[PDB]
Design a protein around this ligand. Sequence first.
Ligand code: AR6
Ligand code: 7M2
Ligand code: ZN
Length: 282
Amino acid sequence: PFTADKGKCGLPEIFDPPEELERKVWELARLVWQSSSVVFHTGAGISTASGIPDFRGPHGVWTMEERGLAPKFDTTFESARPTQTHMALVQLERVGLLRFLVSQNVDGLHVRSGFPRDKLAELHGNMFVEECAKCKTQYVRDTVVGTMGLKATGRLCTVACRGELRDTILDWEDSLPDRDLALADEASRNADLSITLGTSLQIRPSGNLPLATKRRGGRLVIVNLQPTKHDRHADLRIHGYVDEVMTRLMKHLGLEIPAWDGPRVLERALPPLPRPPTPKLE
Ligand SMILES: Nc1ncnc2c1ncn2[C@@H]1O[C@H](COP(=O)(O)OP(=O)(O)OC[C@H]2O[C@H](O)[C@H](O)[C@@H]2O)[C@@H](O)[C@H]1O
Ligand SMILES: c1cncc([C@H]2Nc3ccccc3-n3cccc32)c1
Ligand SMILES: [Zn+2]
């Protein structure tokens, strides 16, 4: 708990130079066009551009602790806005280019961006979400739930119940939520393309799910500034800022990144929207 293994922290960042970065984001578009079933896997790195530090980056939570220094937030969790990345993911799901989204983040931003909860696995929990110990019903709150480690928050269930409401933030010894992990695993096994964004892939089983795609000949793409644990298994590794990678990708796909309306919760995915026709890939 005080000696939980925090993995490798503070590894040097890598930056693909611009022409190589272009070429790789073109190839990623190519793969997205060719695939039947795309699964995205996100970590802390997709929220750094909103002011939330990561864990293992050069100024990440664990990295700074290791050095005796403090992480820095440039926002609260409540005032944080979804990044260009987050909103790109919303659009890709709406046009049917994303089958499923697996996230390690507890920051609540995928939910608050309006991404549909039924195509999202929140493997490590959500700091805005509490859960009734009796009936399992979830409340998505507008402010962060004050506790971590699956503790009673002090509120009760109002289902047509009075069960104890508890946080959904897993501690080190807590096993992952069964529903989310089973769905994430199914999705990753059935995918022909897994794309990891802003994760170092060091936590298991979370960080191992993208490798399940390699199973039936799927492709694996890794987008990350640092090395990751599974770099050697990637078909493509793109070393650059995830917002620059995603904006370029959307531009190749002919998709706009949509406007955020402010915090919103979407339980169930809407009907799919029209999308550009596909290029000929010779
Ligand atoms: N703008 C960016 N663009 C690209 N990559 C980025 C950017 N910002 C950061 N990175 C990369 O983003 C990566 C983030 O890696 P880590 O910080 O391990 O986060 P995790 O989500 O995999 O942590 C897993 C769990 O572990 C914790 O204990 C919690 O439980 C987490 O849920 C780095 O490798 C950065 O170089
Ligand atoms: C996601 C990214 N950076 C930091 C966090 C941590 N923020 C935080 C800040 C203060 C108290 C407790 C927490 N916390 C609990 C789980 C993860 C966090 C989450
Ligand atoms: Zn209940």
